[PDB]
């Protein structure tokens, strides 16, 4: 027959009777010392109220079963954290933690990129103020006219509205015909072309091989400045401190060895217009 | 087309860089090569010309060096298939 | 060859090419006349605004409008900075688009 | 490097081994910075790093740090590509059941626990309780407990009771499954039952128990406690333009499971009651179930989107899975496409390639040639030289394509010739220059068609393009032996006009000393192209073995025929060019040239015919004008006469003489006669109109008309198209299927009216819309034929068998439509043929019959031959090379490794786009011989036939049968046996209206029980037109007399009892309804007494339904045992077709319906291969009642009849190759040695019969019977699971192969394609052979 995971839970909680308004005083005092007899009856009696609260958040990000189960997490926290010294009521205190738990769960389990609780609270203000303005009188929604109603700068409103991720799906058929997907047409920026990969490996080996066709002392100062022969980046004063042992003499051989590779590069068929343009 | 950009998940040729992609080698052309005796021509168009990160880059280096024999490796369409079946709670490996 | 010399079956085709300037979170996109890693032969056809003149013969690969995007955290390769010092080109933090 | 890809269930201990970490948080990335957060779906600590050789913190970002892992915020330094291999795992707090092993056609969990599918779904949702280890309680393990029934169990028993609910209960039921004990219980309880409703249920449950024992998969692994996580690069989260991100449909599914798993883990430590924790564990069920597959009982999430979702299983199924999308196409490099263009100056082995395409296709080959020559130092400088198009780059490009072939293929690849290799030459332009002769194989016209190009890279692929895929190698068709590269309409037009003898022309009667003087006289304009001359010719003869002897003779030919002999090779005589050189005559010359001089002298001869045809078709400026469609002057005398013959009929329709249907057939057959009268009067005036003058005369010669030449030479146009240009168009059809009364009496030269043109549009759009189905139905047929005969490949050189099928020419009708010349050409003989003499054979042994043996068999009177066929081969897992033959693109026989199963499916599916008895009389003269026809000679001198299994044949004076006619039952034979028949005279007469009867002996026979008031009725016609005993119907009989039936009792004249030999009961036959008795009561003829007279889809879907072995809408009824058949009870509702065997003691009774009109009578003996009721017969009962030799004859001759009607021709080897794969499975009749009642393969059943015979067992009582399967069911029988997941359902073949631990090998074609290995067929056979001898040996 027809079976669903929604009505199977509602029929199980609908068999427990309602708690009398004069019987919860004996169960609340016993829960402080610790006993698994009054806590089971107190939570089971409040299961009929979490459904009416979860039904108010219709067409939201979370489903109906996720909203009912999230509200039940606050019921245990509300019972264990309470004080019966007031004696005014007890059902009005459980609905404060159940409603607070839905808001903290509907903003952390809705979007893909999780937003912190300090920036997501003020984001609902810009979205709520934008709804009333668009329906004033044949009005069109825009980010320019909303900056004056909230006294917000022009650069601040563009960042708050742009903070919404609103991620799309790549497994969607673009167009009327369902024959092509969005993921099959995307490219990558990190990986390169097989010809470009060999082009970078050839130039990297030609640069290191050209350094051997020079003086034995001019190749050591250039390998320590830029860090090409297995070295790191450094400055001119650091190389001329201990290895260089000079102030301006290291800077003199650096400008001569810089132009020495310029003439050997132009004669090799690789001019400035072909690489640097 | 000789080379160009490739897709993200399946390393296959595609357009988008002011250039078209490649020619789709369907199953009808595979049966034509299987009807012939071209076994190396069929394996080349299925492994070293598409879905091979270590196959396309190493074959391009061979054409420039002068010699060219083969670079089979393993197609990326089958490497992704193994990682998807394993994610369904079904073990699949190579006995060799 | 008479039907080709007399321009019988010759047709004119008009093609439209658009360039949009969006607002990247790092910086806005503006139409300018300064392009990195180019020469005078590529900037002579443009103007003080950055768009080619009406009536200019454009070949394959010419620049129509000027548009650069700001970049951040490029992480240049140390083998690349040694090659830029050979000619003497300055480092610019703007991607050519 | 790997083999035997195995598949099985994943254990929880192995799932943790694949993973590199456990995910705990449901987020993916940070909102401010775009970095993977820790312990999430995207985490660089569990998976690989994002950037190349760099961690998240940045403490190590060089190559020298590989194994060092940063401790503060860094990760393991890797190549940033391991994000496709690293996996994760989520240790679930509660077990979850797998839907793949739960919701399928077989219940993998239900059959394993003897439980219902609906009942398991009830426990997994926390609704009912089950009992674990019942023991000494009052309930059974199969009995469930409810919420009110479970509370009572703990009160009466207390001890020895354990009940659970949910997924932990199913996991507990599989812990104590007792695998080594449950099989012992099923073996002792299966033979007790006898009903088939329980045999199929206990055996299907038994075969699943042995699968979980030998494979190693424990039943505990069907439910999982930890699930793997897909790598992040397979579910990418990449940004888009404008800061927008785009994720996959698996991130929100993986996030939904983590959100509910962490919520359940926190709900267990708070000591929450069972009312709230049972609903959270229920949500975790459908959370993981919706992640694995979608469409099951758990509805997938649908939020702000139209399509439901794309889960993990949806990536490998649903006509869009990653496994099936690659099997139908894959983009490749080094390719391109452009339009095609005719090049008349190219050779057969070369094509034209633009310079702009050659620079891009051969780009890597130029970079390597510039560095080797010294023009460029680095690859970065060589790339800039190609962009500038330097002049020195063209000299390099011309050298890299000199001997480098390229592949050209058209978009519709119907057969093997769709891909051919050519040597590209550099041409100026943007269009690919194609050869005019290769346009027939490609099926390509110059209307804007495009052709794709491909570049073979390795020299292994370059040698395969030159030795196998070259255009000069595949000059013959792979389906027949005829050349596929033949001169088309433009070349055959120049060769027909050149060799076209004229009566009187310039330079007639002159003599030439050699062929060089003929060209010298023609080029000077002093001799016509076709004039009767006499030229001395020096030719060579190749008829002698190894002797190329030259002969000089003076022949009498024309000028054009002598110029054509200059290009003919030396091995051919001059008599081959003395004809008119039509299209059918040139194709037979290229085929004869291929078998004499070889291939090298033929590829250079077909190019000379194209140059000679293009040269002489331009000199003669043939043109079609308005005066070429000549109209016969007698067409108006036939149309005006036929119009008056209909006016006299319309007057009879208004008077009431004829009806509507009688007038319809009168005017339809009238215009069809006048249409043929105009067509024969048009061709007579069109063909013999050219008149000439020879020394003064008016002589009629053949017409030198442009419209006549194009139809006579066979270039373009036929008799049905010239008929609509000059003669009347005729009667048009209608989409409903009827013919319109008013025909189109006008042609296309005179023009049609407005109503005549609107009528022709009915059949125009009917044929155009039919082409859309011809490409959709035929493409589906050639795809099903490949999926069956793909594994079939030539593997063995010699089988060593003597079995074979008999081959006889089609003698149906007057003449042989297909003699033994082409039916035996290319097939190895099985048994030695014998001459009519003794100890004299023609063939010595099994030999390959070539063109030299066909004429040797035509001189002799040999008519039957036993050849080898694949359907009778004995090679296991393959087909023999000697059983195939030599009918292919090559002259020799088939080689080892040739995939003959793929070329057979492409030979049948390629021409699929072209697909949509009163008396006998001997035509020729010869002796008359009857076979399998037992006749009884009467006293008058005539013969009467009692059997129908035989037929009448006409024996030639040489001893060959050339005419075969079928005769019904009781057909009177006029001539005798062994006499010379008269050509044009009758030999026998029949009666198709009323089925006659036969009598065994003479005597005074009378009707018993014929009171003429209830059973029969005395009928009298007008003026004594009928004086006999007329029978009555069964419905017209009375209620009391309906049980009694009229019967005739045969008694002798002396009074003694007469009994037929071989049968105990006498010849007592009951007369059926609607019968007339010619013989009176008490007086009859000596023999041949008719006591009772018994009164009386095509095209492409026909071939498709014939390969599927489907049962027709009205199957025929055949006999099982050779014996005397009889009727039963008719008033019950059925017909008991009882039959008593006369040779053996084994009665078999069968039932037959009553709506099917039977054609057999009571008291007649029928044979085993005799048909009882008329109608089409399925190929299933013909295989059981007759055998495999009769099935191979009926299927092949029925498929060829659909192809021979349209004009195409396919060899019989391609139909018998597909038939071999259909007759592959076998079925056992008795049980006791097999596992189930079904059947297995014949290759496995034969290897087990030899071990049981020559072993411990003496006899082999486990017999079998051959069964026939379609091209749909035979394809499902595949031992592999990789190839079976392509054309079948993916989610159904993966759950079956997992629970059995099916180790799949790669010994096929379809498996090695998706995996990436070499194929066993072709050149890849040497790779699989060198590995088999080194793996299982040393
Ligand atoms: Mg066309
Ligand atoms: Zn780090
Ligand atoms: Zn054989």
Q: Does A69 touch chain D (CB under 8 A)?
A: yes
- Largest Cα–Cα distance in chain C? 62
Q: Compare all CA atoms of chain C with the CA of A265 and give the residue at the minimum distance.
A: C86
Taking CA atoms, D845 is separated from B45, C5, D831, D1106, in Å, by: 45, 73, 7, 36
Angle between helices A218-225 and A249-266 (to 10 degrees): 100
Contact across the interface for A222 and C79, Cβ inside 8 Å? no
- Say whether A260 sits in a helix, a strand or coil: helix
Question: Which residue range is the domain that position C48 belongs to?
Answer: 11-97
- Say whether D866 sits in a helix, a strand or coil: strand
- State the count of interchain CB pairs (< 8 A) between A and B: 40
Whole-number Å distance between alpha carbons of D1205 and D54 = 72
Contact B30, B45 (CB under 8 A): no
Backbone angles phi, psi at D993, to 5 degrees: -75, -60
Q: Which ligand is nearest to the CA of D799?
A: 3
Residue D937, H or E segment: strand D935-937
In a domain, C43, yes or no: yes
CATH code for the domain in which residue C35 is found: 2.40.50.150
| Cβ neighbours around D861 below 10 Å, total | 13
> Residue D448 C-alpha to ligand 1 middle, in angstroms?
6
Distance from CA of B9 to the nearest CA of A (A): 8
Backbone angles phi, psi at B57, to 5 degrees: -70, -35
In DSSP terms, D1241 is beta-bridged to: D1225
Q: Compare all CA atoms of chain C with the CA of A201 and give the residue at the minimum distance.
A: C79
Residue D836, H or E segment: none
In a domain, C66, yes or no: yes
In a domain, C47, yes or no: yes
CA-closest candidate to residue D23, choices D255, D269, D287: D255
Which residues are CB-neighbours of D129 under 8 A, at least 6 positions away?
D123, D144, D145, D146, D150, D163, D164, D165, D169
In a domain, C68, yes or no: yes
Distance from CA of D242 to the nearest CA of C (A): 6
| Cβ neighbours around D580 below 10 Å, total | 16
Gaps in chain C (C to N over 2.5 angstroms) fall after none
Contacts of B80 in chain A (CB under 8 A): none
In a domain, C59, yes or no: yes
Contacts of A63 in chain D (CB under 8 A): 301
Identify the residue whose tokens are 């048909």. D1171
Contact across the interface for A114 and D31, Cβ inside 8 Å? yes
> Residue D326 C-alpha to ligand 1 middle, in angstroms?
29
The technique by which this structure was obtained is cryo-EM
Taking CA atoms, D1168 is separated from D676, D936, D1063, in Å, by: 47, 22, 18
Contact across the interface for A193 and B9, Cβ inside 8 Å? no
- Tokens at residue A121, please? 């609270």
Neighbours of ion ligand 2 (CB under 5 A): D 55, 57, 59, 70, 73-74
The full DSSP string for D371-388 is HHHTS-SSHHHHHHHHHT
Q: List all residues of chain A from 119 to 178 with a beta carbon under 8 Å from chain C.
A: 158, 162
In DSSP terms, D446 is beta-bridged to: none
Q: Which of B4, B79, B90 sits opposite D10 (nearest CB)?
A: B90
Contact D1213, D885 (CB under 8 A): yes
In a domain, C5, yes or no: no
Contacts of D263 in chain A (CB under 8 A): 69-70, 73
Contact across the interface for B60 and A194, Cβ inside 8 Å? yes
- Say whether D889 sits in a helix, a strand or coil: coil
Contacts of B56 in chain D (CB under 8 A): 333
- Tokens at residue D422, please? 């050519």
Contact across the interface for A228 and C82, Cβ inside 8 Å? yes
CA-closest candidate to residue B8, choices D325, D83, D1286, D312: D83
Taking CA atoms, D839 is separated from D802, D833, D845, D859, D958, in Å, by: 20, 11, 14, 19, 20
Length of chain D: 1338
Contact A44, A62 (CB under 8 A): no
Which residues are CB-neighbours of C66 under 8 A, at least 6 positions away?
C31, C32, C33, C34, C35, C46, C50, C51
Whole-number Å distance between alpha carbons of D1304 and D3 = 9
Contact B3, A194 (CB under 8 A): yes
Torsional sign, CA A140, A141, A145, A149: positive
In DSSP terms, C95 is beta-bridged to: C69
Distance from CA of A52 to the nearest CA of D (A): 17
CA-closest candidate to residue A130, choices A117, A115, A143, A121: A143
Best of D333, D382, D404, D1308 to disrupt the B interface by mutation (most B CBs within 10 Å)? D333
- Tokens at residue D627, please? 């005066």
Q: Which of D236, D247, D279 sits opposite A112 (nearest CB)?
A: D247
Contacts of C25 in chain A (CB under 8 A): 162
Contact D978, D942 (CB under 8 A): no
The full DSSP string for D665-701 is HHHHHHHHHHHHHHHHHHHHHHHS--EE-SSS--EE-
Task: Please state the residue numbers annotated as binding site of D for Zn(2+).
Answer: 55, 57, 70, 73, 799, 873, 880, 883
In a domain, C80, yes or no: yes
Contacts of C22 in chain D (CB under 8 A): 241-242
- Tokens at residue D518, please? 């003929």
With contact defined as 3+ CB pairs under 8 Å, the chains touching B are A, D
In DSSP terms, A125 is beta-bridged to: none
> Residue D869 C-alpha to ligand 3 middle, in angstroms?
8
- Tokens at residue D1307, please? 């010994």
Taking CA atoms, B51 is separated from B54, B73, D233, in Å, by: 9, 10, 15
Q: Which ligand is nearest to the CA of D881?
A: 3
CA-closest candidate to residue D1220, choices D853, D788, D670, D805: D788
In a domain, C4, yes or no: no
> Residue C93 C-alpha to ligand 2 middle, in angstroms?
26
Q: How many domains does chain C have?
A: 1
Q: List all residues of chain C from 37 to 76 with a beta carbon under 8 Å from chain A.
A: 37-39, 42
> Residue D305 C-alpha to ligand 3 middle, in angstroms?
60
Best of B11, B12, B28, B48 to disrupt the D interface by mutation (most D CBs within 10 Å)? B28
Q: Which ligand is nearest to the CA of D70?
A: 2
Q: Which of B12, B36, B78 sits opposite D1316 (nearest CB)?
A: B78
Identify the residue whose tokens are 């071989």. D1062
Whole-number Å distance between alpha carbons of A125 and B38 = 68
Distance from CA of C24 to the nearest CA of D (A): 6
Taking CA atoms, D952 is separated from D618, D639, D806, D881, D980, in Å, by: 57, 45, 20, 39, 14
């Amino acid at each position: 027959r027809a079976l669903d995971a929604t009505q199977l839970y509602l029929n199980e909680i609908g068999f427990s009777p309602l708690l009398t308004p004069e019987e919860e005083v004996h169960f609340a005092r016993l829960a402080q010392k610790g006993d698994p007899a009054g806590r089971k009856r107190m939570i089971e009696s409040n299961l009929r109220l979490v459904v009416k609260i979860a039904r108010r958040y219709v067409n939201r990000g979370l489903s109906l079963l996720d909203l009912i189960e999230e509200g039940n997490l606050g019921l245990i926290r509300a019972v264990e954290k309470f004080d019966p010294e007031r004696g005014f009521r007890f059902s009005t205190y459980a609905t404060w933690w159940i409603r607070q738990t839905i808001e903290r769960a509907i903003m952390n389990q809705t979007r893909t990129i999780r937003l912190p609780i300090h920036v997501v609270k003020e984001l609902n203000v810009y979205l709520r103020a934008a709804r009333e303005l668009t329906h004033k009188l044949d009005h069109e929604p825009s980010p320019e006219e909303i900056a004056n109603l909230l006294e917000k700068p022009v650069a601040e409103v563009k960042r708050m509205l742009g903070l919404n991720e609103r991620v799309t799906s790549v497994d969607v058929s673009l167009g009327p015909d369902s024959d092509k997907t969005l993921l099959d047409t995307l490219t990558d920026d990190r990986p390169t072309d097989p010809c470009e990969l060999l082009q970078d490996d050839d130039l990297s080996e030609s640069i290191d091989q050209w350094l051997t066709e020079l003086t034995d002392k001019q190749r050591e100062v250039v390998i320590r400045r830029f860090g090409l022969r297995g070295h790191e980046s450094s400055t001119l004063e650091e190389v001329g401190q201990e290895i260089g042992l000079t102030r301006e003499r290291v800077r003199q051989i650096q400008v001569e060895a810089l132009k020495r590779l310029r003439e050997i590069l132009e004669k090799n068929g690789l001019s400035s217009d072909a690489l640097f343009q | 087309r000789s080379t160009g950009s490739y897709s993200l998940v399946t390393q296959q040729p595609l357009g988008g860089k002011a250039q078209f992609g490649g020619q789709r080698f369907g199953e009808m052309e595979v049966w034509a090569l299987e009807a012939y005796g071209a076994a190396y021509t069929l394996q080349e168009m299925l492994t070293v010309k598409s879905d091979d990160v270590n196959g396309r880059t190493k074959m391009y280096k061979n054409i420039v060096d002068g010699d060219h024999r083969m670079e089979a490796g393993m197609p990326e369409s089958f490497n992704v298939l193994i990682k998807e079946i394993r994610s369904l709670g079904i073990d699949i490996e190579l006995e060799t | 060859e008479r039907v080709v010399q007399e321009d019988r079956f010759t047709t004119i085709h008009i093609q439209e090419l658009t360039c949009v300037a969006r607002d990247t979170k790092l910086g806005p996109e503006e139409i300018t006349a300064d392009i990195p890693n180019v020469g005078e032969a590529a900037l002579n056809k443009l103007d003080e605004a950055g768009i080619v003149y009406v009536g200019a013969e454009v070949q394959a690969g010419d620049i129509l409008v000027g548009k650069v995007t700001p970049k951040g955290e490029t992480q240049l390769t140390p083998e690349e900075k040694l090659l830029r010092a050979i000619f003497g080109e300055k480092a610019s933090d703007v991607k050519d688009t | 490097e790997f083999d035997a890809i195995r598949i099985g269930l994943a254990s929880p201990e192995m799932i943790r081994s694949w993973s590199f970490g456990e995910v705990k948080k449901p987020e993916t990335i940070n909102y401010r910075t775009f970095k993977p957060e820790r312990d999430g779906l995207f985490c660089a600590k569990i998976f690989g790093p994002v950037k190349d050789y760099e961690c998240l913190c940045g403490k190590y970002k060089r190559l020298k740090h590989r194994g060092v892992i940063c401790e503060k915020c860094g990760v393991e330094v890797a190549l940033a590509k391991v994000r496709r291999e690293r996996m994760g795992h989520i240790e679930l707090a509660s077990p979850v059941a797998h839907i793949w092993f739960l919701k399928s056609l077989p219940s993998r969990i239900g059959l394993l626990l003897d439980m219902t599918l609906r009942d398991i779904e009830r426990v997994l949702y926390f609704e009912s309780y089950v009992v674990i280890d019942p023991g000494m309680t009052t309930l059974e393990k199969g009995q469930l407990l409810n919420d009110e029934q479970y509370f009572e169990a703990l009160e009466e028993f207390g001890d020895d009771f354990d009940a659970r609910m949910g997924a932990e209960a199913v996991h507990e039921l599989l812990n104590a499954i007792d695998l080594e004990h449950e099989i012992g219980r099923l073996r002792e309880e299966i033979p007790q039952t006898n009903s088939e409703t329980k045999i199929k249920k206990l055996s299907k449950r038994l075969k699943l128990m042995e699968a979980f024992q030998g494979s190693g998969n424990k039943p505990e692994w069907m439910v999982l406690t930890v699930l793997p996580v897909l790598p992040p690069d397979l579910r990418p989260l990449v940004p888009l333009d404008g800061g927008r991100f785009a994720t996959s449909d698996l991130n929100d599914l993986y996030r939904r499971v983590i959100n509910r798993n962490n919520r359940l883990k926190r709900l267990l430590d708070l000591a929450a009651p069972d009312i709230i924790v049972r609903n959270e564990k229920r949500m975790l069920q459908e959370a993981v179930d919706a992640l694995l597959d979608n469409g099951r009982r758990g509805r997938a999430i649908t939020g702000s989107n139209k399509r439901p979702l794309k889960s993990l299983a949806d990536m490998i199924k649903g006509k869009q899975g990653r496994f099936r999308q690659n099997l139908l196409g894959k983009r490749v490099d080094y390719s391109g496409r452009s339009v095609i263009t005719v090049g008349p100056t190219l050779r057969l082995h070369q094509c034209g390639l633009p310079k702009k395409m050659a620079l891009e296709l051969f780009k890597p080959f130029i970079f390597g040639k510039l560095e080797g020559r010294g023009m460029a130092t680095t690859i970065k400088a060589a790339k800039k030289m190609v962009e500038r198009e330097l002049p020195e780059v063209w000299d390099v490009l011309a050298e890299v394509i000199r001997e480098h072939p390229v592949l050209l293929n058209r978009a519709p690849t119907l057969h093997r010739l769709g891909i051919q290799a050519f040597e590209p030459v550099l041409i100026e332009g943007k269009a690919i220059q194609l050869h005019p002769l290769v346009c027939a194989a490609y099926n390509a016209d110059f209307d804007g068609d495009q052709m794709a190009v491909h570049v073979p890279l390795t020299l292994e692929a370059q040698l395969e393009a030159r030795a196998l895929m070259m255009s000069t190698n595949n000059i013959l068709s792979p389906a027949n032996g005829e050349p596929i590269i033949v001169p088309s309409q433009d070349v055959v037009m120049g060769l027909y006009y050149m060799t076209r003898e004229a009566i009187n022309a310039k330079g007639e009667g002159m003599a030439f000393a050699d062929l060089q003087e003929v060209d010298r006289a023609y080029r000077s304009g002093q001799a016509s192209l076709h004039a009767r001359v006499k030229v001395r010719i020096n030719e060579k003869i190749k008829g002698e073995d190894g002797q190329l002897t030259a002969n000089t003779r003076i022949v009498d030919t024309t000028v054009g025929r002598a110029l054509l002999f200059q290009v003919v090779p030396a091995g051919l005589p001059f008599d081959v060019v003395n004809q008119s050189m039509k299209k059918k005559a040139i194709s037979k010359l290229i085929n004869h040239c291929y078998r004499v001089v070889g291939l090298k002298d033929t590829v250079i001869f077909a190019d000379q015919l194209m140059y000679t045809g293009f040269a002489y078709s331009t000199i003669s400026g043939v043109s079609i004008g308005v005066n070429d469609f000549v109209i016969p002057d007698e067409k108006a005398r036939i149309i005006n006469a036929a119009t008056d013959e209909v006016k006299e009929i319309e007057s009879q329709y208004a008077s009431g003489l004829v009806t509507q249907g009688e007038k319809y057939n009168k005017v339809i057959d009238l215009w069809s006669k006048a249409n043929d009268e105009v067509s024969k009067a048009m061709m007579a005036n069109l063909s013999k109109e050219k008149v000439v003058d020879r020394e003064g005369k008016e002589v009629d010669q053949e017409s030198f008309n442009s419209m006549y030449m194009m139809a006579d030479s066979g270039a373009r146009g036929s008799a049905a198209q010239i008929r609509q240009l000059a003669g009347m168009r005729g009667l048009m059809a209608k989409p409903d299927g009827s013919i319109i009364e008013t025909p189109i009496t006008a042609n296309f030269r005179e023009g049609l009216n407005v109503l005549q043109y609107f009528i022709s549009t009915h059949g125009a759009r009917k044929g155009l819309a039919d082409t859309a189905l011809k490409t959709a139905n035929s493409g589906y047929l050639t795809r099903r034929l490949v999926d069956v005969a793909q594994d079939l490949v030539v593997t063995e050189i010699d089988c060593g068998t003597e079995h074979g099928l008999l081959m006889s020419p089609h003698i149906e009708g007057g003449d042989v439509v297909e003699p033994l010349g082409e039916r035996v050409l290319g097939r190895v003989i099985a048994r030695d043929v014998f001459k009519p003499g003794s100890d004299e054979v023609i063939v010595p042994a099994g030999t390959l019959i070539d063109e030299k043996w066909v004429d040797f068999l035509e001189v002799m009177s040999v008519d039957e031959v036993v050849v080898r066929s694949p359907i009778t081969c004995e090679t296991r897992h393959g087909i023999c090379a000697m059983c195939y033959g030599r009918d292919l693109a090559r002259g020799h026989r088939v080689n080892i490794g040739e995939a003959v199963g793929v070329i057979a499916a492409q030979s049948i599916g390629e021409p699929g786009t072209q697909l949509t008895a009163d008396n006998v009389q001997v035509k020729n003269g010869g002796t008359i011989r009857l076979h399998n026809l037992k006749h009884v000679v009467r006293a008058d001198g005539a013969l009467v036939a009692v059997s129908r299994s035989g037929e009448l044949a006409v024996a030639d004076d040489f001893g060959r049968e050339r005419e075969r006619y079928k005769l019904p039952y009781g057909a009177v034979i006029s001539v005798k046996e062994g006499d010379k028949v008269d050509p044009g005279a009758i030999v026998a007469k029949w009666d198709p209206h009323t089925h006659p009867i036969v009598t065994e002996v003479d005597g005074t026979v009378a009707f018993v029980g014929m009171e003429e008031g209830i059973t029969v009725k005395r009928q009298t016609d007008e003026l004594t037109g009928l004086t006999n005993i007329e029978v009555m119907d069964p419905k017209d009989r009375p209620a009391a007399g309906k049980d009694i039936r009229p019967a005739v009792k045969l008694i002798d004249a002396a009074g003694k009892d007469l009994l037929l030999p071989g049968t105990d009961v006498p010849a007592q036959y009951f007369l059926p309804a609607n019968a007339l008795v010619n013989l009176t009561d008490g007086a009859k003829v000596s023999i041949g007494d008719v006591v009772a007279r018994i009164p009386q889809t095509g095209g492409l879907p026909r071939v498709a339904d014939l390969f599927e072995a489907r049962r027709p809408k009205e199957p025929s009824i055949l006999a099982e045992i050779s014996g005397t058949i009889s009727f039963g009870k008719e008033t019950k509702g059925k017909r008991r077709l009882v039959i008593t065997p006369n040779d053996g003691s084994d009665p078999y009774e069968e039932l037959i319906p009553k709506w099917r009109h039977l054609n057999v009578f009571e008291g007649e003996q029928v044979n085993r291969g005799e048909v009882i009721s008329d109608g089409p017969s399925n190929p299933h009962d013909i295989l059981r009642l007759l055998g495999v030799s009769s099935l191979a004859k009926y299927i092949v001759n029925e498929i060829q009849d659909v192809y021979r009607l349209q004009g195409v021709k396919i060899n019989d080897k391609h139909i018998e190759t597909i038939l071999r794969q259909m007759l592959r499975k076998v079925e056992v009749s008795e049980s006791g040695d097999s596992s189930f009642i079904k059947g297995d393969q014949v290759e496995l059943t034969q290897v087990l019969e030899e071990n049981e015979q020559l072993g411990t067992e003496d006899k082999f009582p486990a017999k079998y019977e051959r069964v026939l399967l379609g091209i749909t069911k035979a394809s499902l029988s595949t031992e592999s699971f990789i190839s079976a997941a392509s054309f079948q359902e993916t989610t159904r073949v993966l759950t079956e192969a997992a629970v059995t631990g099916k180790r799949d090998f790669l010994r096929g074609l379809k498996e090695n394609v998706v995996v990436g290995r070499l194929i066993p067929a072709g050149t890849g056979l040497a790779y699989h052979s060198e590995r088999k001898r080194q793996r299982d040996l040393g």
